[PDB]
Amino acid sequence: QKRNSHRIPATIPVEVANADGSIIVTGVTEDLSMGGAAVKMSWPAKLSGPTPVYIRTVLDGEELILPARIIRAGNGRGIFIWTIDNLQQEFSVIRLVFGLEH
């Protein structure tokens, strides 16, 4: 369909793990959108390509855990797209992006 990004530049601590737990790093966000995230961070491997991860952070006292795919890593920067497989995942993304607009 068609999607507005609701790109919101914001700086918030996040933790990122790949799906098998072999990699775990910390960082801060640069921007968030309905599409994904840009994060200041250093990924310790070369990306084949879109690699499934979990992103964890806190906002307004709430823990938010969002599945995602890292799609690029360029030291100082990790780029992600959200993975949304249900309503709770859809709304965690909404809570994050609009929670930051608020």
Side-chain angles (χ1 to χ4, degrees):
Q1 32 168 298
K2 225 166 99 170
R3 204 139 174 233
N4 262 330
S5 66
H6 297 93
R7 187 86 24 104
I8 169 65
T11 298
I12 69 172
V14 298
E15 312 140 338
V16 187
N18 58 6
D20 66 19
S22 49
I23 303 170
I24 299 184
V25 308
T26 301
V28 292
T29 63
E30 295 171 15
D31 70 82
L32 291 166
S33 56
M34 286 308 304
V39 186
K40 191 179 153 190
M41 61 168 257
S42 307
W43 196 249
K46 272 313 188 178
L47 241 1
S48 146
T51 290
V53 305
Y54 297 109
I55 296 184
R56 175 174 185 268
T57 187
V58 174
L59 186 70
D60 306 334
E62 294 154 35
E63 185 185 50
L64 307 178
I65 298 161
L66 314 91
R69 269 178 275 197
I70 187 159
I71 59 165
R72 196 212 79 119
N75 183 271
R77 175 115 120 237
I79 307 300
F80 304 79
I81 54 174
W82 306 122
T83 295
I84 304 185
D85 298 322
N86 62 37
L87 282 190
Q88 180 110 70
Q89 290 181 356
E90 174 71 30
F91 282 105
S92 297
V93 172
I94 293 174
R95 282 193 279 134
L96 178 56
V97 175
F98 287 78
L100 284 168
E101 281 180 32
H102 188 80

